[PDB]
Design a protein around this ligand. Sequence first.
Ligand SMILES: *O([C]1[C]([O])[C]([C]OP([O])(=O)OP(=O)([O-])O[C][C]2O[C]([N+]3=[C][C]=[C]C(C([N])=O)=[C]3)[C]([O])[C]2[O])O[C]1N1[C]=NC2=C1N=[C]N=C2[N])P([O])([O])=O
Lengths: 364, 364, 193
Amino acid sequence: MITAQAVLYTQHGEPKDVLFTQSFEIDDDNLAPNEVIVKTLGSPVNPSDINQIQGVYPSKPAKTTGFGTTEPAAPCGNEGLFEVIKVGSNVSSLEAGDWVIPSHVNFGTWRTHALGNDDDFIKLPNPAQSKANGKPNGLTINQGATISVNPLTAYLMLTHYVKLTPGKDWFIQNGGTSAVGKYASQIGKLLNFNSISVIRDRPNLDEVVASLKELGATQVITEDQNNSREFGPTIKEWIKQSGGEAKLALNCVGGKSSTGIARKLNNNGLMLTYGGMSFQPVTIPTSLYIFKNFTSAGFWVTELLKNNKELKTSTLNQIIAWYEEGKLTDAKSIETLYDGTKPLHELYQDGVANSKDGKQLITY
Amino acid sequence: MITAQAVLYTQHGEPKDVLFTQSFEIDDDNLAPNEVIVKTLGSPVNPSDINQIQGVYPSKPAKTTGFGTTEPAAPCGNEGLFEVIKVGSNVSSLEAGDWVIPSHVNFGTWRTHALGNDDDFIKLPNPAQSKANGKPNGLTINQGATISVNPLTAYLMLTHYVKLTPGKDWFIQNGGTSAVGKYASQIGKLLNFNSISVIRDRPNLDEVVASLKELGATQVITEDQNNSREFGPTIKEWIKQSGGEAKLALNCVGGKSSTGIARKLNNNGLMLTYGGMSFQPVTIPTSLYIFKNFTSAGFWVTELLKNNKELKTSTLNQIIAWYEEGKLTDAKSIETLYDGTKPLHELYQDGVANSKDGKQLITY
Amino acid sequence: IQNGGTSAVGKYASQIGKLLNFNSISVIRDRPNLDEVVASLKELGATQVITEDQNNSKEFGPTIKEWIKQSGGEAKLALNCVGGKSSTGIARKLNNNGLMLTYGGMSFQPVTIPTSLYIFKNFTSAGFWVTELLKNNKELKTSTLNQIIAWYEEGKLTDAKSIETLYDGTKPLHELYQDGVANSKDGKQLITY
Ligand SMILES: *O([C]1[C]([O])[C]([C]OP([O])(=O)OP(=O)([O-])O[C][C]2O[C]([N+]3=[C][C]=[C]C(C([N])=O)=[C]3)[C]([O])[C]2[O])O[C]1N1[C]=NC2=C1N=[C]N=C2[N])P([O])([O])=O
């Protein structure tokens, strides 16, 4: 028998208040024929995971007593990389040593182990398999553990809604230092799209601007520049020189930031709102709608891919291939290793509290 | 020779500051084969006419010296009703005595007369012609003078964008007592669409609600009710119990009002913004975009119909038909008759200053 | 509680309710002249008038419960002449051990009652047909008439006020009736002689 740990809550609220660790038992002897046991290698903290715990995210796992609690409790985390440790006698899709992610949301990835079927998982090539299949690179644990939400989100927003002419057209995005922002910049570079990333000013501004330009942002501006009527004509010059148009805006901030990036689009522009990193609503001047034919819409990768498994597979395959080819790198995570001395839920609580420092990955 | 008067400006600014009256001559003995002289019967003051004079509306007539001014001058007003007084030899589409409106914007309707081409005008049936054609009603001067902006606006937003299932689906609009609002309620009754009108509270709320329901609003709520957490579920019930969905929001207010109506839509809703209440941007919760697949877009009748004579025709013909059949009613305008004892531009200046009293129609 | 609140019966029930000092809720369809219809029904003795939208509303349910608690009483009886959703809504408003009487049926709609009401609330749903009830019950018929009569012109009950047309030889008798049938929507038609 394996003794596992899961991060659970019995009631919605802030992670600092409601999370605890539950020890539970998994039977790793005498597997059913289709069953698969996996050990976690790592799982990140994404905003969606936190919103799920807070109760403001309408897709969530059921509260159950299945982890051996008396009160119904929900697990946490939708994304993660797991190593297959044992498979049942009718399992050929997976074997010991294989890398997998969950095939569906609401799996509960903030935990040490899981028992499911082979259809609960999607296989990723492990480094040994990538090299054997003649690839110059294999995935890292961070790359595998964060492959499923943010890279697909960036890829689909940039490709699935409006067609940007390679070598000419632009997108503009706020939250430029976000993991999603960093994938968008790289995917923009790979597809030959011009882009403007908007970021908050900070003391190490120059270092950040350089990182983002290296990733693929054509220009990086601050939110102060975004707000600036004086600066607008400079952006117009860039776009005019390119021969192209700013056709797409990606908004994960809301408020004034959403106003600023919308104003920078050419007529007939599209904005996709995929997040709201301050509680501020999407705010658009009436004149953009009426006089510039602006359109504002939403994006939600979970809903988009629900009955679109071909689209999911195709997108994921492209990200894997790019990683194997050395053409894509990961939005880097701050890693915290679980080793048994500090309760698992506290690692995640610290991760939630240190969100501002950057993407957090709990490792195992 | 005809002595005529036109309200002009040589520089953009406030109507109270920049309008003047110019006398000019039209040669009625020298018509080119396709030319037409008309005499104004009436023309309204609309916000867009004012914004045009102000220089903040991106559609405007050219400034020329063609009215006999030293400096280039623009005419004023975009809609109005005229009577044909003479036509050239190749004109078969119009006859002396006919009623017409401008076929395009930027014609200049704040004046006593105009020379144009026959394709500068669109024929409306005069009262005599309507009665001779067997119809129960001829159009009033106010109905013809105001037919081209607000009725077409309401009709097109309701039919041109999302298909509302007759007998089941809903639209919701703010600015419920506006000209467009009241047309939309009537069109909703005529087409069998359910609707919610949002209006400002007033002492005679009982009378206004009854008036709007008679016009065709299914439900009328105040802006306080639109904002109310307590009231929200009552609206969701109206829609749910009907078996239809709230698919379309019409927004002319912005701000909190726009937030409130957006929240009342079902999933996959569409908002059209066609106006704003001064400086109040369109404000939409991020959550509606992400989780409810909301879309917000704009509506500008001027741009929609600019190169779509077919759609303009078809729409106008239906509104004319409804007026002839007594199925559509206009809001009464405050009429000021030009008789030459007071300069024409001052009539329009007073109408601008008195806009809060109600729709201003200058008559001739 | 009753639906078809503007019906002739509805209007008498509101009055008789007031005379007997029974509290009542009349349900009516919404209309542009709601305020005027509501006033007229309350003048006749409806304690409360609601729309069918309100009848449909889970949100509004507790407001009705407050009315009933405040009076130290219970809603024991529902009168249904509409059917469908409307019959569902008025049934739900009864306290435990309620009775619905169905005496009419506006257009196609069956009497539709949640299972839970029958099982958990001891609800009973029955019919009413004045003819059948009074076929062999003249003692009950006359006793009821005696009270209506006494209230009449003790000045305590108001009739529904008919549009009369005299058979005075101006037109044939059947044409008088034919017109009142064609003119049913204006109100109750009485041919006098
Ligand atoms: O500015 C902040 C960061 O740029 C950014 C957050 O970065 P992150 O790496 O921690 O978060 P990500 O995992 O990339 O994604 C965060 C947002 O995107 C939404 N999202 C992601 C994927 C899929 C969906 C979807 N709809 O399919 C949605 C998610 O909900 C998040 O909203 O935020 C910036 N930030 C933080 N506070 C801010 C702000 N910008 C402006 N104003 C305020 N207050 P930094 O680098 O710290 O300065």
